[PDB]
Symmetry: D2
Subunit: 335 residues, 4 copies
């Protein structure tokens, strides 16, 4: 048995990486790759837009308006789409009996104001918000193993929570000093699109979304702790490195922080813990891992987490959740 898999928004950068993994996956194959109804890319091959897939996957991109053209007989739907589209589509696919893995921010947080403030829309499916599993794979339980709607976390929130969650859960941080998360992403995180801001000559190094980015409250809500989160656009296509600075609870030691991380991740295959030193970004790009190292001096902690923004930050985590949902090896198709 193989899972029929629909990939919506397949022509974007995250979408291309989903096509790669699902094609490769021994237990899944693709029914269709869709674009929007009036997409200029309708009828082009996936490999025309993403030539790394030439000779590997060459499915045409089909324009989708009514989802009934694409829902019957589909086991898994990946929504590699922005929130408005995912808000509209996900309920329809669930009703058609599909298990939906939404990469958008649309179902990530069970809260109305969250959507009004940071996404600028009123959320129309409160029941789904309650039902959605937050697909932070290393930490999800069996709301996931048996959810039919999985909200895959954002790229920056993924590294951030992998670094911070075990420490906060062990009460190792003095949260009266909000953790400061500074992160730099490659430009693929902006999406495939012609805009001035992601135009080649416009990229160097700059912070953005200062005190405004929608990933900040996602990280704060899910960790149960206020944080500073400042993203930066760097002049490379792929990867996120996060440098995270905290005040430890008084008396907390290096060995104590190491114990908490060793216990969280030693049997988690997609998290690579550095015993000493801190990871370099190149060492994870094109791989599905999150790499984590840290240092302690006195009452301060600096923890550093890297990932490929399109892999553990998007497509690989999505597929990793599908593996958990459907009972396959957790890393199946990823490594």
């Amino acid at each position: 048995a193989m899972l029929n898999t629909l990939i919506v928004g397949a022509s974007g950068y995250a979408g291309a990486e989903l096509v790669t993994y699902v094609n490769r996956h021994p237990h899944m194959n693709i029914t269709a790759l869709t674009v929007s109804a009036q997409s200029n890319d309708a009828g082009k091959l996936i490999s025309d837009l993403h030539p790394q897939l030439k000779g590997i996957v060459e499915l045409p991109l089909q324009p989708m308006s009514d989802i009934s053209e694409f829902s019957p007989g589909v086991d898994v739907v990946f929504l590699a789409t922005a929130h408005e589209v995912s808000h509209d589509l996900a309920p329809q696919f669930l009703e058609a009996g599909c298990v939906v893995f939404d990469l958008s921010g649309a179902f990530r947080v069970n809260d109305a104001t969250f959507y009004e403030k940071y996404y600028g829309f009123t959320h129309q499916y409160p029941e789904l918000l309650e039902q959605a599993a937050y697909g932070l794979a290393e930490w999800c339980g069996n709301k996931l193993k048996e959810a039919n709607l999985i909200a895959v976390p954002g790229c920056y929130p993924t590294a951030a929570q992998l670094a911070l969650k075990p420490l906060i859960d062990a009460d190792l941080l003095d949260l009266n000093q909000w953790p400061v998360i500074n992160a730099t992403s490659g430009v693929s995180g902006a999406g495939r699109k012609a805009a001035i801001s992601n135009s080649f000559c416009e990229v160097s190094l700059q912070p953005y979304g200062v005190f405004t980015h929608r990933h900040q409250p996602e990280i704060a809500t899910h960790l149960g702790a206020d944080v500073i989160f400042t993203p930066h656009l760097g002049n490379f296509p792929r990867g996120i490195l996060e440098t995270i600075t905290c005040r430890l609870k008084s008396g907390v030691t290096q060995a104590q922080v190491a114990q908490a991380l060793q216990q969280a991740y030693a049997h988690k295959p997609l998290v690579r813990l550095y015993d000493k030193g801190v990871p370099a970004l190149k060492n994870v790009v094109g791989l599905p891992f999150c790499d984590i190292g840290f240092a302690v001096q006195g009452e301060h902690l600096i923890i550093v987490a890297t990932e490929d923004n399109l892999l553990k930050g998007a497509a690989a985590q999505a597929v990793q959740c599908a593996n958990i949902r459907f009972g396959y090896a957790e890393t199946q198709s990823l490594i």
Copy 2:
């Protein structure tokens, strides 16, 4: 006395570099910087779009529809605009008594088919074509010293002709084998614009305009010799490196090629001739020079020419011609 200077298309990448030099120039200053009538940037400061100019030049960008708003009392007009715009505007500014330095391809070659084939328009000003000085500064005579319309050469044609012209003029090449010019440009050569092709993640290394680029016939017409010309888009913002491979006329030697170049360029300040070895691109970026080195083995020549595509390839050559036209030191404002 100072020259009143209008810069049309000031908000583009070449335009910003013209603003820098003209501001700096002791004998010129700026009356206005214009954008198109319905430009989204109308009313923004030049330094909002190009923050390297913050605190240096902060003139607002004015939308221009009727040129009579901007022509009276203007000594010099730089058209940092594409050919259609330059075709329309340049005749009007000349009639208003301005000396026009057009950066577009619109007046570069005295030939009708040239425009139909490579620019896809029928040229409406044959007399101007006859009158335009081709602003390849090291080689222009007194059609320039006294022209009122200067067509500034394209960026790739500039390095190409500086390398090849003295050799062809000394009959040192066997032109039965067309020179092969392979060049790589930084992405600023594509212009300021949101398109997929110059989007950050879409750039790596690729040839383009293969047997179609409009700079090929400009180079061939002006050199009086058929050439292969293949440009490549590289993943850096600024600079052009050209590697040019020729068959020498039988018996032609290294010393003979060196003599021809030494004689062409020894007293030309913006051309830096390498006695031995070949230039690296970083050594000219942000400078107004063209750097040239070469090697000979047997009957083959390899000559290598670099420039900053926006400086000697665009703005600096434009200003260099203005210096010649108006009698200032050739390098005034450039270095």
Copy 3:
């Protein structure tokens, strides 16, 4: 049954990519990874130097002086070493009964002067030169299927010959005009090493080895045709793009060139032929393919070939040959 596999020079950049593939390969595993006798990296883990391998392969790097420490029971030896080392070691491993896949230039060409001129040493194993299979995988016959010494071609020669060989073999080029091969490589092609020339700030774009590079005569000897070959160091870590300009034999057409390439490569899985247009480098980096596109106008041909310099240009071709030698699927471990 699995092949015991020794990787000599494992700590270099090509060596790391061999470790990755051989680890992954279902029919091979690694006995040891070696460094030189007094290497500063002796005793470090492979994944300390190449952290992309963390949690995947963590074999220590062992210093090797006498090969008898490492030869018994070894089926396959990869020499990821420079020519002098490979010249000394390969004969010893062959005598111990190992099948040797040398990545160096040491056994690539059956000719003495070749070694004196371009490698600056007199070759001491003429019989081995006669015996070595040249591992250009798409073109090798059964000198390979049954060779015990395979000389893996250089990175630039690989793309060059894949583009040119089928055309020359079909007499489609006028070789009175030598093909001009201009290529740009990422800096990994320089090897892992601290030198000024591959130091970060020293890299931009520059030709090198002008009329001197050792890959030129390898390409010319094996193609049976004189060529110009000029490599360039570009400011990126991985990939080679070659732009190759030829004069066609009189009367030769686009369709005729396409037929020759379609017939050469249609059933060759690691060569991806572009029907129209020319490949972009990013689309092959991290993949084992060589991508080829071309254009014809009049009597000129421009053919463009890309590869990952460490994969099809080094490690993947090495492993591909091993697959052919030992009877595994040609792409086994590569894709």
Copy 4:
């Protein structure tokens, strides 16, 4: 009158930028450029190593052992050298009557343990430590206007203190929460040198000097406040961007922070204050400025400061101090 100017360590990256400015400066010219006694670059031209200077400055690099070969008649000495060399040389040049501008860390902080802990040497000139002016140009008074020894601040400390000093001096920060300074530098900050760590393929994005970097205590001592300082090596040659996160003193507002910065910098020409938004690194590279923007939400401040690491972070600040010391326009030669 012109100042005779000696540049020691001229062949390094900062040294090359000093040569550029001093050459250009109307009131200074160069007596000699020196390298170490057994330097491999002795006798090479400055422009051989730094070809951007070809045809502009072509002084040979002279090996210096005894300083009496180079001290008589010299008005100004720039030491573009590391601390041990500067510790040894600066006292000798001062004794010869030269005004010394040391770019090393050797005289930056009046404290012995500082040198033992972070520089691993016992400082032999306590009187000089007392006499040295700290050349943070916007803040220096008349210990500078009349010092004969100027310790030019480190590159990262410069942006950091320009951002933080006016805020701390106005008591606007709650220093019970140490400011967190995360910074990314281009690889030129590592110096000209062949090492693995600054080799092209070894650079991507990585923190370094975590809780160990010598710039941390320099920043903390001079600000009179404990800080976290974590530098990162990024994959570009030039520039530093610092993102600095603070807890404000209770009640402190955006307008209050803006007032303090406007008052500090409005008449300081090399500091470009952003009224709204935060600077992008490309907009300062190759320029002598420090660009500063900031945002406030609630009780947190994020202030962002950029500079060219070799210009305002090194050579331009050095020259700026010389201008102040000798009474020239502050920006003379810089812009």
